[PDB]
Design a protein around this ligand. Structure first.
Ligand SMILES: NC(=O)c1ccc[n+]([C@@H]2O[C@H](COP(=O)([O-])OP(=O)(O)OC[C@H]3O[C@@H](n4cnc5c(N)ncnc54)[C@H](OP(=O)(O)O)[C@@H]3O)[C@@H](O)[C@H]2O)c1
Ligand SMILES: NC(=O)c1ccc[n+]([C@@H]2O[C@H](COP(=O)([O-])OP(=O)(O)OC[C@H]3O[C@@H](n4cnc5c(N)ncnc54)[C@H](OP(=O)(O)O)[C@@H]3O)[C@@H](O)[C@H]2O)c1
Ligand SMILES: NC(=O)c1ccc[n+]([C@@H]2O[C@H](COP(=O)([O-])OP(=O)(O)OC[C@H]3O[C@@H](n4cnc5c(N)ncnc54)[C@H](OP(=O)(O)O)[C@@H]3O)[C@@H](O)[C@H]2O)c1
Ligand SMILES: NC(=O)c1ccc[n+]([C@@H]2O[C@H](COP(=O)([O-])OP(=O)(O)OC[C@H]3O[C@@H](n4cnc5c(N)ncnc54)[C@H](OP(=O)(O)O)[C@@H]3O)[C@@H](O)[C@H]2O)c1
Ligand SMILES: CC1(C)c2[nH]c3ccccc3c2C[C@@]23CN4CCC[C@]4(C[C@H]12)C(=O)N3
Ligand SMILES: CC1(C)c2[nH]c3ccccc3c2C[C@@]23CN4CCC[C@]4(C[C@H]12)C(=O)N3
Ligand SMILES: CC1(C)c2[nH]c3ccccc3c2C[C@@]23CN4CCC[C@]4(C[C@H]12)C(=O)N3
Lengths: 325, 321, 336, 341
């Protein structure tokens, strides 16, 4: 009756949302995995009544032993890549190691946080390890005969990125620090195409999307899921923020990738991601058109499966600004 | 063989209507103008179009010039008389023509229209440029003589980018670079999700009216939105930048009270649009599906002549910038 | 501060949903209007704690006095038209009389249950009083200079038509009586165009749309609102029913309107169907059929009620899941 | 001038590809066939297209017959060898050709593909008609030599109405009248919202392959759904009825066990439809069914061809108005397709 689901990164944003969503369904038993059960965040997960296991993804045997009995697993990696991984050893990423360990432990159903490979799609003329490592994990999971289901889920930009101070530093004053001309100014290169920039409130929605996948894993196997709460251009984001907060805001694109300030190291290292996205006419996920219909179908299903508990629709940018500003 | 009188055939809207209808042998175009010796009048003559001289302000003359018309397209001008400006919308030459068409027994009417901000805002707003046409719309909707009366509502013309005064007031976009090197567009937000409608008046509007005349009964009393593309002002600028590789940006006029130097009294229109959450047409959501259908229908009625699809903002920039 | 709203037909389906929706917002006070406060349905409302006033729409003066003090009014009419109304004299329908009474009483904000006029749209070819009676009221209210806001709202096919017996008899066994070959068969003419048939759960959704309008009446003045919960073809409706209930169902079109059973109200429905086909299925007459606006209004009411109820409209799949997998066929409707 | 080899150029898919690309001076169409003396091979020759003779089952000859190609469009046939029917998907002549194209150094590939029901369902389904093409898709996606590899996935052809086995097996629609005077279509539901995709293979498909070749890098490793219209089976029949004024209807096989499964291809189609219903109608497996991209690849080819032809895809209504309203005797029901009985 009861299906156990191991949650990687349960102390983190993606896995944290996953754990919080799945625990609200009696058909599932959540086994959070963390490196330190004494962690501040781990104790918060232990206050929700969640089973907590301590293990390190870089230890395949220990990980395999910690996933022994899981019906499903949600896998993700971290913001910091090891030098070996940053230099093209994508098989050494702890997320990818965990996926292989799950194969050995016999876990039948996998939901894997993934990203497109700029290298694979551009014929080798681009290399963006931050994305390509997760894409490697997706290539391994899709080809593995052991799994009964492997579904890649691709996260959008978090709305919560607006709370990172260097975010405010890098991309113009937007959305907290106004400039000399009195504007909350956002400065980013265009995405390309029709400027269909995807955004999500990671906390409230991502976990419910993964939950919806686990409600019927066979239907979603080997079919990429885009975790998208809203789709709008940078300029529409600014006008929406201004309407909500009644604070002047504007968008000034970085049309020339070479003419971005070297003062900003998050613009210079992202210049290959931005170029790959532009080359793809803004189709940043690589599998097909950017659409949030599936996400709105995976959120409603989790809503029903949870007992009509919580919210039935994903958080839009307008609502996030109304709730956070 | 159905005869159609075309008001404003020397103008943008009526000109597109005449040029589109002429390519369907089932329809015979009778252009109406005040001056048949005009350059534009002669251009219409060079295409082999019948040109009759009449003034909309003369109901008696106009009734005589419409006799025998199966249908009529009606439009007015940018110029309102002081009397019309001050509320006597029955005197606008377009609405006079509509009443004359009723007198002459013309059975099928397509009327260039706009919503009445005054009527929709409970009196808060007064915009004669729109409300005058709305007067004709209600009159035609209530008139029992017509067999069909269909209102058509034009979006912003792309060709407004060629009006020097438009370039003057709304920033430099898309011709005049500013100090920081940007083609800058300065406009109040439309409201809602910034679904700003635009049309290439020359190539598409006439085809939409043509499509209406292909089945007047199905469109009677149903407003048609003449929309070629739907996008936000910022999308306009990013599209322009991609097409031309000329830096461009959008800086909204957030406060209609603190606008600059730039005496365009279109403020009440902008405020009414915002009050409608951007639903500038007033009848329902902004949609171009109907326009696309009508354009394709004209394409096929004309013999697969011309374009089957409406001109988008990107294509307009490609062809004119 | 607290805005009073009179609800016509509060004992009925449309007004009942309106009352039940506006009751959950303390900014509004619901004054139900009924002819008989002793009714089973009226006492149901009294048991819910709703003010009940007795008045008859056919009495303009009494109606005016009973509407006095209302900030807003929801107006609707009934399924049975007097013969005089049947033959024109649309001004005499109690809904339209009530609209004029509200104008006399000075009610500033109006939401009116409406439908397109086939006669006005067809150049006289068609005459369907079931629609045209409400269209008369719609134009009268649109032209009325006294109202501060006037919004016409138009109902789609109720899902609850499946509980109305007259629906079950004529339009095939669907969805309760299986037919000779074991099929739940629906027998109806095509709508026209791409078969974009609108449906709504009248009980749970219609009232929330009226509520959403009253939340910002100025923005909706003179703007037709389509009360649409789902848009799907008749065949898609039947296949969805089959998927939900694992019970055979099918759609049998009347391709020839002359071959449709027309044994007085079936004659008015033949003309209505012909008008819809003549409009390529654009049965509302003002523009394309769309449920986007309905969704916006439903969400707005959801928020206003304190995030109570559902944020989304009920689809055909949801309705079949809730009312067929598990329902007495005795609801109010056309008396054929 | 960039040369593109076209597999199956004498067939429906490759034929549309050749006819579309030839009208664009930036490309050279090199048709590939087993028999250059064929009556359909001579039609292509009458169009002014190079015709080379090679067999896909001969990897070396195929390699020498592709060398010099800037791009290649790859497709397979309706008949699979017994070895291929039984799993040996590497032996399908289309997949051998794909390996030959890498072998030959063709830098840009457009591969006719379908999802693998087995791969997506954890082994619950085995439908070689789709999975064979999916094998080639996986190989092309993983091959490091190609500069671009784009899978394109065909919908139901409207031209299935000209394939005789379709008319026989699936109730007779739209040509064979039944007891009650109905053109009856008999098919299981697709699943989900009955978003059945259809395309006019002749007029539209080639333009989509062409649009991909207009910017291969932007489409590399991105599945393209070749869709002209999206509608339910019942909507298909009612649309046909409106166009032709002939009674027509759709009678679903709600229970797949009640579908005629006399012959082996009908049972493999039962398993395919079961897979579709399993995926809630997502018959392509990569994502939602959509025709926006197809409408973007048709318009782009329209422009590339010199604004010649149609800018838009053919809808079901327009196809019925073009092929089933007039008698049009030249439209005979003899097209290549599944040979069931
Ligand atoms: N913020 C963004 O920009 C953004 C948006 C889009 C997508 N992404 C992508 O998603 C990833 C970051 O996701 P996130 O923000 O959820 O990360 P996060 O908040 O740091 O969570 C990742 C979790 O990984 C666990 N972990 C780290 N090293 C580990 C190891 N060696 N073994 C086992 N577990 C380990 C940590 O929890 P324990 O202490 O429990 O082990 C940590 O909480 C990156 O690839 C990023 O590019 C993020
Ligand atoms: N982008 C836009 O500005 C836009 C969009 C929405 C709607 N509109 C509205 O549509 C109108 C402008 O349309 P348009 O571009 O066709 O105007 P236009 O280019 O100025 O043409 C007006 C036409 O009316 C004719 N006319 C003028 N006075 C007349 C009279 N007294 N009797 C008879 N005919 C007369 C003119 O010359 P002849 O009489 O010599 O033929 C001409 O053919 C305005 O009301 C405007 O507000 C335009
Ligand atoms: N699915 C549909 O059939 C549908 C959808 C579109 C529009 N419509 C139209 O809407 C109308 C039916 O709506 P409904 O479902 O609400 O009808 P209903 O269930 O009969 O309710 C009508 C309401 O009006 C009240 N009423 C009836 N006669 C009255 C009178 N003379 N004076 C005052 N109040 C009176 C009734 O209350 P008491 O009984 O106590 O008065 C009742 O609450 C018809 O014109 C129909 O064509 C319905
Ligand atoms: N509606 C549909 O039926 C549909 C939908 C989606 C996709 N598909 C799939 O696509 C395939 C059908 O495509 P189609 O209509 O283009 O096929 P087709 O009409 O059968 O054409 C086959 C082509 O391939 C060539 N060929 C066949 N066997 C060969 C071999 N052993 N070696 C070399 N060449 C060989 C033929 O050579 P010659 O040049 O000598 O004739 C011919 O040009 C099937 O797998 C089908 O399942 C079709
Ligand atoms: C009258 C107006 C405010 C206006 N002022 C202008 C000043 C300069 C250039 C261009 C315009 C336009 C263009 C428009 C475009 N239209 C959109 C629907 C109705 C409306 C409003 C709008 C119109 O009448 N013409
Ligand atoms: C008059 C009608 C044909 C009708 N005949 C019926 C006869 C018996 C049962 C049920 C109905 C209904 C249902 C409807 C629902 N419709 C939604 C759009 C307006 C309209 C028309 C439509 C209506 O007013 N009642
Ligand atoms: C293999 C199949 C079940 C099939 N069986 C048939 C048997 C006889 C006639 C005609 C067909 C077709 C036509 C199709 C149409 N296509 C839609 C998407 C892929 C698919 C599935 C589908 C295909 O491969 N050809």
């Amino acid at each position: 009756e009861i299906k156990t689901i191991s949650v990687i990164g349960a102390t983190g944003q993606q896995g944290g949302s996953v754990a919080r969503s799945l625990l609200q369904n009696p058909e599932f038993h959540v086994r959070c995995i963390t490196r330190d059960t004494s962690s501040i965040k781990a104790k918060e997960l232990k206050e929700l009544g969640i089973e907590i296991v301590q293990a390190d993804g870089n230890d395949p045997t220990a990980m395999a032993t910690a996933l022994k009995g899981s019906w499903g697993i949600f896998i993700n990696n971290g913001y910091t890549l090891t030098p070996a991984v940053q230099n093209g050893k994508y098989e050494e990423d702890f997320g990818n190691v965990i996926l292989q360990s799950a194969a050995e432990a016999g876990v039948p159903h996998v939901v894997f946080s993934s990203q497109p490979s700029s290298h694979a799609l551009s014929g080798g003329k681009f290399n963006t390890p931050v994305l390509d490592v997760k894409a490697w994990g997706e290539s391994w999971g899709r080809a593995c005969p052991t799994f009964q289901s492997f579904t890649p889920i691709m996260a959008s930009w978090y709305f919560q990125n607006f709370f990172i101070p260097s975010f405010v530093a890098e991309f113009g004053g937007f959305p907290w620090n106004q400039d000399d001309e009195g504007y909350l100014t956002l400065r980013l290169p265009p995405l390309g195409g029709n400027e269909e920039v995807p955004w999500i409130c990671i906390d409230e929605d991502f976990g419910d999307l993964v939950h919806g996948i686990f409600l019927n894993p066979a239907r979603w196997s080997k079919r990429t899921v885009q975790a998208v709460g809203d789709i709008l251009s940078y300029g529409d984001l600014c006008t929406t923020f201004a309407d909500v907060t009644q604070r002047k805001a504007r968008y000034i694109p970085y049309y020339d990738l070479d003419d971005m300030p070297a003062d900003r190291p998050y613009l210079q290292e992202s210049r290959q991601v931005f170029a790959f996205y532009q080359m793809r006419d803004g189709e940043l996920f690589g599998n097909g058109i950017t659409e949030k219909r599936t996400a709105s179908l995976l959120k409603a299903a989790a809503f029903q499966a949870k007992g009509q508990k919580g919210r039935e629709t994903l958080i839009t940018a307008r609502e996030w600004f109304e709730r956070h500003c």
